[PDB]
Structure formats: structure tokens, C-alpha cells
Amino acid sequence: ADASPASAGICRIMGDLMRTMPILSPGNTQTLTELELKWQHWHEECERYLQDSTFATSPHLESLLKIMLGDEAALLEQKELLSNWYHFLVTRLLYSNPTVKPIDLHYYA
Amino acid sequence: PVGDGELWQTWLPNHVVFLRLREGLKNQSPTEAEKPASSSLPSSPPPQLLTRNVVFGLGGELFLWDGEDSSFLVVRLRGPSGGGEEPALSQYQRLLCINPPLFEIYQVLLSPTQHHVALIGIKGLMVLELPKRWGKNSEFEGGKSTVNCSTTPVAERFFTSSTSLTLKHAAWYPSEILDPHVVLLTSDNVIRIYSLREPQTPTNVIILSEAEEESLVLNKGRAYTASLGETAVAFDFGPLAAVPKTLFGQNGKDEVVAYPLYILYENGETFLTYISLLHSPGNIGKLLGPLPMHPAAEDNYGYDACAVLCLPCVPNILVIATESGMLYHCVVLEGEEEDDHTSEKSWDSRIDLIPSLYVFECVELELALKLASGEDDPFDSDFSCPVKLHRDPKCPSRYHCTHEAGVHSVGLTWIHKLHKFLGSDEEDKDSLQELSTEQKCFVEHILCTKPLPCRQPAPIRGFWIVPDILGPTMICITSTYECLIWPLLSTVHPASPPLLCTREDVEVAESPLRVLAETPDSFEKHIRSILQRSVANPAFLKASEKDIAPPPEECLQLLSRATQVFREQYILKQDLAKEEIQRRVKLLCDQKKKQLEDLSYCREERKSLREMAERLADKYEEAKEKQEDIMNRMKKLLHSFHSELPVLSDSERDMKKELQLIPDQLRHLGNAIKQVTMKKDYQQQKMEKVLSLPKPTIILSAYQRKCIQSILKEEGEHIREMVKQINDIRNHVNF
Amino acid sequence: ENGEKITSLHREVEKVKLDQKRLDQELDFILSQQKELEDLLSPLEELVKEQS
Amino acid sequence: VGTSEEMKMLRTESDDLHTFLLEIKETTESLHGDISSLKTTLLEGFAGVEEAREQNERNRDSGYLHLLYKRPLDPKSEAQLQEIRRLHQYVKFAVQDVNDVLDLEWDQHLEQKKKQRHLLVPERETLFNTLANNREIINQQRKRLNHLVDSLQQLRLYKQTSLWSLSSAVPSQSSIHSFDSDLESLCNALLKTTIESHTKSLPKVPAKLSPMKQAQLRNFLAKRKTPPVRSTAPASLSRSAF
């Protein structure tokens, strides 16, 4: 954004989506269903920017949006940036199941 | 979440306990089908059918009386909280009685202390003690499949001797602070309180009949008082109250506190008594009544009164109910003090102040569904049975009614207005004017088991309201042991104002929608108002594989009643909600268009204001250069108008002395500047001649930088709140 | 939210457009009064050219 | 009503233009100042024409010439002498001020060059001591501002609702020697959370009604007719399709 005043506006939409993501905070008195319903809005807002084609001027930012949406095809296009299968697992849980339980976990592994 | 709620609706009616009870009832039915009658006549009426509740719940488990084992069957409503395993349809505990009850049970009741259960029958009481919970699950005896429970018979020697005595009504005494006491009403018009410490002798006894001074005569007239309704039928407790100071001699000072017990007769008269188990029986326990019911009624408010319920509110609301399905809403108020004016010749100087009952409204229940018969038959027979009243454990403005043909829910919308009017100031008349606006109660037919005149009912055997584990949720169990479940609304909603959208729009500068940002629910609440139902079809119990097939004509009228209610109360309101969302979405599309046209005009004036400001700077410097040569013509003329003066003044000559002195001070200052420059040159060249070895970079750690960035945040946000608080005070203290 | 911005934005457009147009006219008044001063000054510049 | 992008473009291009309605306003409200300055220099000009008129006629008297021996300076000649005196005193002070700042730098260079011969660490604690100073200055202005609010509430000039305030946090060292202090801190916190006490009374009796509200409610309900609220069957089955 400092070097490239043509992408900088779109790079800041990406960066602001990277600030609206509902990550759990250990000091914070919320439910899992609150995290879940907020993350569902964030997903319904990220996919919205993919339908109006917002990132189709820089394919790197278009990939980052698919990764942040839990796209298992775009995540496997990143396999040369995932040095092991258990980092791929934790990435896939972050962007496809943030309310995962121990008794679901085997199937994802 | 939300999806947690649907699983229990499909699971619980299919649990193995409801399969056991639907198999026992089959095995009971083979034996008695063949003997021909011979000529005799029983000189006796049939027994009264008492509406039942042989079910309760505690902490998250449901308790059903199995009279074929003589036990409670105990089933859990809390699934494993994480585990990936399904809740086991086969799992329960049995709580078996050590001594079995020697009578048919029509009702069960848990104690205020939650440790003891009354087992209630027409000829007795037995009380069960709950076994101690422990183990990983807080289970009875740590998870045993059968547990044996202590059981104590109460008033046994009175019921086993007096063959013409029966129970009418029973409850626990309202205390968490005493031994558990049980209260009974029996077929002699006497109330009796028993201790579980002393279960064969009453702690207190209250006679309800006026029968002093005529003694030493026997028992027979019990036929003839009952024909006049002079039988006590039911009772309930109001909240803990300070006793009226007129009921004691003028000695006391301590304010005595007791429970008001309200008592109902078969004629529909009500009486009061103040009961304490903490004070001496001096005047405490005197009967007060009959309590006058206002306004006066020309039928006399029925003569078939069967149940009573005292709501935990101020003033008290006493619900009175009949076998005809009428429910009266009596507000209880203390009586009036009479002025000494204009009266004569009353003849006892001993008027206790007796409280008055005030009917706010009455409800008429559809006990079985009314259909379209002809106009010409004066002898169709309205289907009466003993109404059973229940308190809602999460909504103090709702109560529930179970009968033989179904279940009804009732919400008193005006209770919130009554608590408003009494809690505002003593000049507030307009909260009393709100109490006059015709928001009646709402009445809700949840379950129907007699949907047609021809059909036999399925009388309720179990009723409970779950508060916390399924949300607020109702559980009903039939005469056939079928389990039926409804989630209850958490709030008694009054009706909303009439349609906030008969508006025509008017343009000056601002949006009509600003007023609708002030409340976040605004538009969704307008749709929720349009969708507000005022009739619904009740949930129907399925027909049985032993029922008679009805005439087609009853089935057509039941269908047309149902499709009319769907057309009038659902379909019409959903298309009205659709037209409202169509109107709202259009206005937002057209306002969104306007904002792009508005923005695009301001985008062109962005150019206009620049191609104006540039020329205003051009035109200013033109006027400014012109001012300076006008002034530099002026400053020359004034200089010529002083040059023609023929002699030097005293001041010209003496300014000339000072101007001749300054050059030698400038000779010293113009060496001092050079001395300070050559000082700087020497110092700077002595700083330069050190810059040939490196300083170490002070790498503040990623956590130590984050520490300073957190402290500078806390302190910068404290500074913002102080700048704010100074301006907030300055906006209030204008001088 | 978008409307409260755009309707308040529009009001400062017409404000700056009013005050810029006021400065244009207060400059015409300065340029006119500077001439009244210049036509007044010039006769004093003639009297000194004769007296000298 | 739209896409997520349309409703966002309507925010950015509004703020990307609101920024310029400060840029072009600040130049407009500034140029009004210099246009007001120029009007002042114009009125100096109108005064100078009339000084020049009076002095031209004053120079034509033969009596006036006799007093010139005792004239003060003209106000322009003395204003230039007062400016020369002001500039002389300024050039004299700023020579001393710059001389003495250059010795205050230079003995501080000698002081740093003394300190450089006995080891390390002053460049850590000036940062934390300034933070500690700012943090008690924040507490002193906060102590003063509450005492003003107490005083204004004493005087009844101010009335308030309720407000709240903020708390601190700190991060750990990473580099491997603290763990038993991190644990003893946690141990003392667990010891300081171990159990508390019990109470007993009667319940509070509920509030009694006002006799005036009670008598009003009797006088309302005794006049109310009580027609029954029926279970509402649909009032015309004579609208069936069969």
C-alpha cells in the first residue's frame, strides 16, 4: 500500500477484512454461538466481495480471499506454502470450522 | 445455539419409558369381556373423575409415576455436553417405594425444600424422600438402575377408620425454613396440617363451618349441604403478608407475619385465613368471609366451582375456575373503613375488616371444539369437567389449564399496567387510563384431544413446564401415555399499535427514516406486528387404532374451520408482510439512487470550488501589488513634504549623536557573532571527529514494544476521557 | 449513515460556494476604493513637481 | 437493496470528497484574513493622502518655520529609531542566548564523554521515568477534576448520571529465567481466591399499597362490567368452499 497507490485501496479492503475476522479472545465473555454467528456474518461479507469481483485486479488478493473463505481448492493451490499436512489441517479449521470440538477432530485430521 | 432444540422434540416421545407404559396398558386390556347381566340395581352415583398430574421434574430430570412397579421412572433432559455420542433412548433410573401406597394416586407434589414428594390419593397420603445424589453425573446413589426410597404414610389411621371420609385438596405449607408440613382438605369441611416429624397427628386443625354451641348430636346431613354447594373444594396460598392490626388486641407492637390461605366452596363462595407455624394461636387462624365479589352478578358467578390459584403479585390475583370451564380474575383489595354518617341500628359492634374480591374479567374455555349443528335443537350438552390450574415458573403474568379434552394457556396482558400504575406517583391517573384500554387477556388452545363431538377424550395424566434446559418448554402426557411437547414464548406479548406505515411522504432536506434508527427492532417489529395471530388451530391428538370412524360431515366442518383459520390468520398476514417488505425495499433502492445522484453533483462542484479559489488568489495578489505601489507613491510624497525644512531641530541633532554611537556597538556585536560562529565551528568539528565507531541498536523486544504501546494506549484513552469530562462540564456550566 | 454524510457534505459545498462568491465582490470593492485613492493621490504628485 | 461493494463505494467517495471540503474551505477562510489585511493597508493609504495634504499647507506658513528648532522627530524618523533600538537589543540578546545554548550543548558533550568511560544503560530508564511522570500527572488532573465535580454538585450547579474508567496490563520476558516467580505469583493468586462467608435474616415483607391508590382501584373495578373473553372460534363457517 505504501509502494503501490494503484492496489493500496484494495489492499486496505483485504487488510480491513483481516481486522473484522471473529477470533476468540481469552479475556472476553462471549459464547461459542456468538463467535459462530459473527463468523457466519464475516463469511457472508467476504464472499460478497468475491461476487462483485473486488479482487480480480490482483490474483494474489483473490487467492487470499478464497483462503480466508476456507476454499479447499485454493488452499491446495497453496500446498507449496504449507510445509506439512497438520498446518493445512489447522488452516482448514481456522477458515472452515472455528467451533470445532475434540470429538469432531479425527475426521478433519 | 438454535438447532439444539429440535432433537429433543423427536427423541423424547420415543424414549423407552413411553414404550413400556404404551405396552403395559395393552396387557391390562384382555380379561373381562363376557358375563351376561342379571337383574340388580346399584343404589349409588358414579365416582367423580379427578383431573390428574402424576408427573414432575427436578434440576433437569423428569419423574413419572409407574403404578405397575409402584415407583418413579426418572429420565434426563441434559445430554452429554460434548462427546459425539447420541443420548441413549434406553437410559433411565427407577426410584422404588420401600413401603407401597395403599390407594390410587391422582396427583404428585414436590416440596419447597425439593427433597420430599407427596403421593396423593382420594383415601390417603404417602410421602417419598429423595435419595442422595453423587458420582460423575450427580445421579441417585451414584448411578444405580434401581434405587429404594424411604416412604412414610400420613394421616393413615384417620383414612383407614373413617370409611366415609375422602380427600378433596392437598398442598405443601410454604416454607424453606421449617420442617416439611403438608396441608389437607377432607370431606368434613376441616383443613388439617401434618408434620413429617409426627405424620399421624396434625400440627394444626381449622374447622370451616360456623357450628358452635349445638353439640352432642350425630353425623348424617352431608347429603344436603353438598346440594347447596356448602362443601369446601380447593385452596391456595398467597405470598407472605403482615397481619391486619385489628385482628389482635391493642397490646402488640411487633408486626406478626403469616400466609394468607384462600379457600373455595362448591357454591363458589371464597374465604380467607391467616396461617403461621411460627407464632402462638391467639386469634391467628380465624376464618374471614365470605369474601364479597364485585361487581355483583345476576347468575351469582356459577355454582360448579372446582379449582383456585393465588398468583404471587401485589395486589394478589385469585383465579377461580368451574366445571363449566369459566375462569374468573379476582383482584384482592383490603376493605373500606365506613364514616359514622347517616346510618342507624346495626346490632353487633364487631365488624372485622374483611377484604373484597374484584373481577377484572372472565374467560370462557372451548373445552371441546364447537361445530355447526342446526338452530332447532334446544338440548345439545356443553362438555364440562374439573379444570386444573398451574403456575408458570418463568412468566408471572401467565398460567395454564389442563382438562379432560385438552390444554389451554392464558396470559394477563394488564398485569404490567397494574404494576406500572401502583409503582408511579400518587397523582398518576393516566396509568389508570392505560388500565382502561381494552387489552384483555390472551387465551391459547395448545392441545385438543376431543376435536369432534363423537370422539372420546384423552385426559391429561402429566403436566410440567421446563424453565432452563429446553428454554421455557411445556410437557403434556395423555391418558394413553403419549408425550407431547411445545416451546413456550418467554414473554406475554401485548398487542402492538395499529400499522406505522399509513404515512404519505413529505420532502424537506431530511429522511423520514431517522425516527426509525432510534429503536434497533423498528421495521422487524412492524413485520412482527403484521404477523401477530389472533386465532390459531390447536395441535390435534392423532386418532387411535381402536376409535370409531366419524361421519364425513364432522370431518368436512373440522377441515373448513382449519383452512379458514389458515387463510384468515396466516396466509393473509404473510402476504401483508410481503407487501410491507416490497414497499420498504423499494424506498431504500430509490433513496440509494438519490444518494448517488446527490454525490455525483458534489463531485462536479469539487471542480467548481477549485476553478474559483485559484482565481480568487490571482485577483488578491493583483489588488495587493497595486496597494504596495500606491503606498510606495505615498511614502515618497510624505518624504518630499519633510525635506524643505531650513534648520536642524534639537531632536535631529541628538538622534544624530545616538546614530554616531551605535556603529561602534555594532563593531563589538559584529565580532561577538563571529566569536559565537567560530565557537559553533569548533564544537561541530569536535562532534564530527567522534563519528567513526558504531552505537549498538537498542532492540526493544516484541513484547517490550507492545508493553509501551499498551501503556501509551491506556494513558491516551484516560487523557481522552479527561478532555471529554472537561468539555461535558463546560457544556453544562455556561458562563 | 451514507445519507447523513452526503446531505451534510452538500451543505458545506453551498457554504464555501457562498463565501468564495463574497470574497470575489469584496475584492471588487477594494479595487474600486484603490482607484478613488489613486485619483486622489495623483494631484499631490503634480504640485511637488512644480514646487521643486 | 444492493451489493456489499456498492454500499461501501458510497462511503469512500463521500469521505474522499469530505476531505476536500476541508482543503478548499481552509484556503477560503484563510484568504478572508489577507483580504481583511489589505483593507487595513487601504485605510492607511487614505490617511496618508490627508497627512500629505495638511503638511503641504503647514509648510506654507511663515510663523511655523520659527518653531522648527524645538520640533521632536517626525513619527516615521522616531519609529525607525525605536526599530533600530529594538533590533540592537534583540541582536545583543540572541548573541548571548546562542552563546550560552552552545555551552549547554558543549558541557553536555563533555558529560556524555565522561559517562562513556564508565559503562552502559542510561538510554533505558529516561523512557520509563517519563511514562511514570505522565501517569501521575494524569492521576493529578483526574484528582483535581473530580474535586471540581464534587464542588459543583455541592453548589447544585452540576448534576450527573454515571461514568466509568480503564485498567492496565503487562507482558513477560521470554528469555528463560522467571518461571518460579511466574508460578509463585499464580500460587499467591490461587491462595487469595480461596472461599468467603454467609448471611441470615427473615425475608422483606412486600410494600403495602397506598390507601389512596387502593380506593381508586376499588372505585375503578366496582364500575367495570365484566363480559366474558371466549375462546375465539371463526365467526362465519358460511364461507367454506364446500
Curated annotation (Swiss-Prot), chain A:
Top-level taxon of the source organism: Eukaryota
Phosphoserine PTM sites in chain numbering: S4
Subcellular location: Nucleus, Nuclear pore complex; Chromosome, Centromere, Kinetochore; Cytoplasm, Cytoskeleton, Spindle; Cytoplasm
Family: Belongs to the nucleoporin Nup85 family.
Subunit structure: Component of the nuclear pore complex (NPC). Component of the NPC Nup107-160 subcomplex, consisting of at least NUP107, NUP98/Nup96, NUP160, NUP133, NUP85, NUP37, NUP43 and SEC13. Interacts with NUP160, NUP133 and SEC13. Interacts with NUP37, NUP107 and NUP43. Interacts with CCR2.
Record: disease: Nephrotic syndrome 17: A form of nephrotic syndrome, a renal disease clinically characterized by severe proteinuria, resulting in complications such as hypoalbuminemia, hyperlipidemia and edema. Kidney biopsies show non-specific histologic changes such as focal segmental glomerulosclerosis and diffuse mesangial proliferation. Some affected individuals have an inherited steroid-resistant form that progresses to end-stage renal failure. NPHS17 is an autosomal recessive, steroid-resistant progressive form with onset in the first decade of life.
Protein name: Nuclear pore complex protein Nup85
Curated annotation (Swiss-Prot), chain B:
Subunit record text: Interacts with NUP214/CAN. Interacts with NUP62 and NUP98.
Residue ranges the record marks as coiled coil: 579-645
Source domain of life: Eukaryota
Keyword Acyltransferase among record annotations: no
InterPro entries for the chain: Nucleoporin_Nup88, NUP88/NUP82
Keywords: Acetylation, Coiled coil, Disease variant, mRNA transport, Nuclear pore complex, Nucleus, Phosphoprotein, Protein transport, Translocation, Transport
A GO CC term attached to the entry: nuclear pore
Name of the protein this chain belongs to: Nuclear pore complex protein Nup88
The keyword Nucleus appears for this protein: yes
UniProt cross-references to Pfam families, sorted A to Z: Nup88 (PF10168)
Disease involvement: Fetal akinesia deformation sequence 4: A clinically and genetically heterogeneous group of disorders with congenital malformations related to impaired fetal movement. Clinical features include fetal akinesia, intrauterine growth retardation, polyhydramnios, arthrogryposis, pulmonary hypoplasia, craniofacial abnormalities, and cryptorchidism. FADS4 inheritance is autosomal recessive.
Modified residues (Phosphoserine): S29, S44, S373, S431, S436, S511, S534, S692
Curated annotation (Swiss-Prot), chain C:
Modified residues (Phosphoserine): S42, S52
Transmembrane segment boundaries: none
Post-translational modification: O-glycosylated. Contains about 10 N-acetylglucosamine side chain sites predicted for the entire protein, among which only one in the C-terminal.
Residue positions with a glycan: T7
Subunit structure: Component of the p62 complex, a complex at least composed of NUP62, NUP54, and NUP58. Interacts with NUP88. Interacts with NUTF2. Interacts with HIKESHI. Interacts with OSBPL8. Interacts with CAPG. Interacts with SAS6 and TUBG1 at the centrosome. Interacts with MCM3AP isoform GANP. (Microbial infection) Interacts with Epstein-barr virus BGLF4; this interaction allows BGLF4 nuclear entry.
Disease: Infantile striatonigral degeneration: Neurological disorder characterized by symmetrical degeneration of the caudate nucleus, putamen, and occasionally the globus pallidus, with little involvement of the rest of the brain. The clinical features include developmental regression, choreoathetosis, dystonia, spasticity, dysphagia, failure to thrive, nystagmus, optic atrophy, and intellectual disability.
Domain notes from UniProt: Contains FG repeats.
Family: Belongs to the nucleoporin NSP1/NUP62 family.
UniProt protein name: Nuclear pore glycoprotein p62
Species the sequence originates in: Homo sapiens (Human)
Classification lineage: Eukaryota, Metazoa, Chordata, Craniata, Vertebrata
Range within the parent protein: 367 to 418 of 522
Swiss-Prot record, chain D:
Region (Leucine-zipper 1): 10-38
Region listing for Leucine-zipper 2, in residue ranges: 131-152
Post-translational modification: Probably glycosylated as it reacts with wheat germ agglutinin (WGA).
Residues at the site labelled Breakpoint: Q82, E83
Tissue: Expressed in thymus, spleen, bone marrow, kidney, brain and testis, but hardly in all other tissues or in whole embryos during development.
Modified-residue entries (Phosphoserine), positions: S30, S210, S240
The protein's role, per its UniProt record: Part of the nuclear pore complex. Has a critical role in nucleocytoplasmic transport. May serve as a docking site in the receptor-mediated import of substrates across the nuclear pore complex. (Microbial infection) Required for capsid disassembly of the human adenovirus 5 (HadV-5) leading to release of the viral genome to the nucleus (in vitro).
Subunit structure comment from the entry: Homodimer. Part of the nuclear pore complex (NPC). Interacts with NUP88. Interacts with ZFP36; this interaction increases upon lipopolysaccharide (LPS) stimulation. Interacts with DDX19. Interacts with XPO1. Interacts with XPO5.
UniProt name for this protein: Nuclear pore complex protein Nup214
Encoding gene per record: NUP214
Section of the entire sequence shown: 731 to 972 of 2090
